Design a protein around this nucleic acid. Structure first.
Ligand code: ATP
Ligand code: MG
Ligand code: MG
Ligand code: MG
Ligand code: MG
Ligand code: NA
Lengths: 65, 151, 72, 76, 65, 116
RNA sequence: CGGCCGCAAGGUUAAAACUCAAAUGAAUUGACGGGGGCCCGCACAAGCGGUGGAGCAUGUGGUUUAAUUCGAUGCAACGCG
């Protein structure tokens, strides 16, 4: 998380360490555990990624373009 | 409007001085569809303003009216339950149009004599950032820079 | 019951409890007035058309006195 | 807390003074030169200044206890 | 993709720190197999080794302590 | 007084405010300037620009100590996160490094439930 | 209701009188949603000028009258037949 870039930085640009935890975990860990919404949210999550492989097969659509 | 994009309107140059900007100023303070009387007031307004400044038009209408045009105004941006006004930039074509519509508005108050005197006494004060018209520039601009938190 | 009140300095000797009554009356007043009261939160309370005098340069309507005293 | 409320017997509409020039300086250089202003039935206009700027003598010349050296005031 | 442990068929240990540090982020967390490419079998040993290494204080739980 | 040369500037960002403080390297506070303590009450203090006013107001009230190098550690989820570490670069303090300390429990305390 | 279990909450086994000509499942066409996407119109936004404020004209409700003829009476009736 710490950034030094010793002498010539003048620029924060800590997206390298910004995009590890805070983007997801801090805005999600504040509520809503319930122990069974996650198993239906995740179930509909990776069920919502498998059809993207079905439209990776959707190349053979002519559409005349 | 919604679908099309309107190009522009070609306005005849001002007769006495072949400038397009002054004709738009003439129309803005022209009411009731009486263009004959409007040009009488406008020319008299610069008639009693050129002598005060000392030179004909480059000081009577260019600088004195660029001291009132705003550079940033505010518009409502209701999107998802919001009722605040987000500052935006104003186009160079619209900058002038706001200016003339303000000098005329500021000269519609301040009842002294015929409109030639009321407008002339307002164009002068706008040369030194004094008149009511330039006050509305502050009113809008201070409100713009007060709500800079939104962008 | 006059139209225009000149009221040189109203806040001179007042009680600071009569000052509040004077402020209430002045706000509720629907006529015309001028006044030169030097009190800060009197002109700050009501004034909007400042006429600042000074031996060489005079100011006319800077604003609601807050832009005035924040610029100067 | 006294209960004071100034009413109005008749309402003014257009303006009050329409002052143009006074040229009022007692003995030294005039404390103000032009002072051309109107009211349009405005409000307030809290004149301010230091101890010795001339607000009270301006008010006196405005009302009529004194008169300006050159110019006019005229009320509605 | 998985060209790190598939050849050296063994059981990972908690003393080989020089290899565990290749499977950690700069915040201290374990790198998932989706990014690294390690197979499922050795990941459950890679995760086990790190949690033993932390307890003995050969690795940090978080980047700061 | 005491002319402390190097200090630390905690940034307590949050969804409702942005509390900006400046402290010495041993945690003894010197001065602070919260976002909502600078005329931003209401929804306005939950804005990035409202945090800048907190940073500028905190440049003073510590100027007597004469700080030239600052270690800024940021906390909490909110918009007053980036807009106050840029405002610390312009106020004159030279930012040595930027830290994000933030309590991330290892699946410990049970969160609340209070939104429907 | 009765039997059994239980400290209690209750569980389990389990009817009848009376009433109706329906209740229900999947699917189709619409309509609707404070469901989603796209598009249009003086729909909004950008401007000008009006109504609602007052005197009068006119029409309509009501009220009165012996009669105040009849019809129109959301948008699409009310300077309408
Ligand atoms: N009779 C006088 N003789 C000399 N100078 C005068 C006289 N009357 C007024 N002045 C000058 O006019 C200036 C402005 O007049 P005024 O008395 O209103 O001043 P002020 O000190 O601002 O007001 P005040 O003390 O009355 O509240 C004064 O500062 C003073 O120098
Ligand atoms: Mg509660
Ligand atoms: Mg069922
Ligand atoms: Mg009516
Ligand atoms: Mg019928
Ligand atoms: Na005085």
């Amino acid at each position: 998380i710490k950034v030094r870039e010793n002498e010539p930085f003048d620029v924060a640009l800590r997206r390298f360490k910004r995009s590890c935890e805070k983007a997801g975990v801090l805005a999600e860990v504040r509520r809503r555990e319930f122990y069974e919404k996650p198993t239906t949210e995740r179930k509909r999550a990776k069920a919502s990624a498998v059809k993207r492989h079905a439209k990776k097969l959707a190349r053979e659509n002519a559409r005349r373009t | 409007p919604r679908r099309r994009v309107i190009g522009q309107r070609k306005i005849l140059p001002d007769p006495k001085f072949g400038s397009e900007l002054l004709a738009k100023f003439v129309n803005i303070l022209m009411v009731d569809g009486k263009k004959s009387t409007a040009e009488s007031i406008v020319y008299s307004a610069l008639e009693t303003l050129a002598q005060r400044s000392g030179k004909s038009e480059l000081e009577a209408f260019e600088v004195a009216l660029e001291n009132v045009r705003p550079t940033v105004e505010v518009k409502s941006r209701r999107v998802g339950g919001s009722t605040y006004q987000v500052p935006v930039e104003v186009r160079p074509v619209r900058r002038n149009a706001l200016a003339m519509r303000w000098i005329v508005e500021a000269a519609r108050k301040r009842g002294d004599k015929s409109m030639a005197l009321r407008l002339a006494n307002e164009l002068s004060d706008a040369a030194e950032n004094k008149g009511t018209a330039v006050k509305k520039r502050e009113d809008v601009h201070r409100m713009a820079e007060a709500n800079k938190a939104f962008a | 019951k006059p139209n225009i009140l000149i009221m040189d300095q109203p806040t001179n000797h007042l009680d600071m409890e009569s000052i509040e009554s004077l402020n209430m009356a002045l706000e509720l007043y629907q006529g015309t007035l001028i006044f030169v009261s030097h009190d800060r939160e009197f002109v700050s309370s009501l004034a909007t058309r400042i006429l600042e005098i000074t031996p060489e340069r005079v100011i006319d309507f800077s604003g609601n006195y807050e832009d005035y005293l924040r610029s100067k | 807390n006294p209960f004071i409320r100034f009413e109005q017997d008749k309402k003014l509409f257009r303006n009050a003074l329409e002052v143009e020039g006074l040229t009022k300086g007692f003995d030294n250089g005039p404390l103000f030169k032009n002072l051309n202003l109107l009211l349009e039935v405005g409000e307030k206009l809290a004149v301010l200044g230091t101890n010795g700027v001339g607000k009270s003598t301006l008010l006196k010349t405005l009302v009529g206890d004194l008169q300006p050296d050159s110019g006019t005031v005229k009320w509605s | 993709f998985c060209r790190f442990t598939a050849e050296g068929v063994q059981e990972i240990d908690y003393k080989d720190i020089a290899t565990l540090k290749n499977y950690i982020t700069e915040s201290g967390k374990i790198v998932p197999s989706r990014i690294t490419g390690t197979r499922a079998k050795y990941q459950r040993q890679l995760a086990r080794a790190i949690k033993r290494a932390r307890y003995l204080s050969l690795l940090p739980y978080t980047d700061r302590h | 007084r005491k002319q402390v040369s190097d200090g630390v500037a905690h940034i307590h960002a949050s969804f409702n405010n942005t509390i900006v403080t400046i402290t010495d390297r041993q945690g003894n506070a010197l001065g602070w300037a919260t976002a909502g303590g600078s005329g931003f009450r209401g929804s306005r203090k939950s804005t990035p620009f409202a945090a800048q006013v907190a940073a500028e107001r905190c440049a003073d009230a510590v100027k007597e100590y004469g700080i030239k190098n600052l270690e800024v550690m940021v906390k909490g989820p909110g918009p007053g996160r980036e807009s106050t570490i840029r405002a610390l670069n312009a106020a004159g303090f030279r930012i040595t490094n930027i830290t994000d300390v933030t309590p991330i429990p290892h699946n410990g305390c049970r969160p609340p439930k209070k939104r429907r």
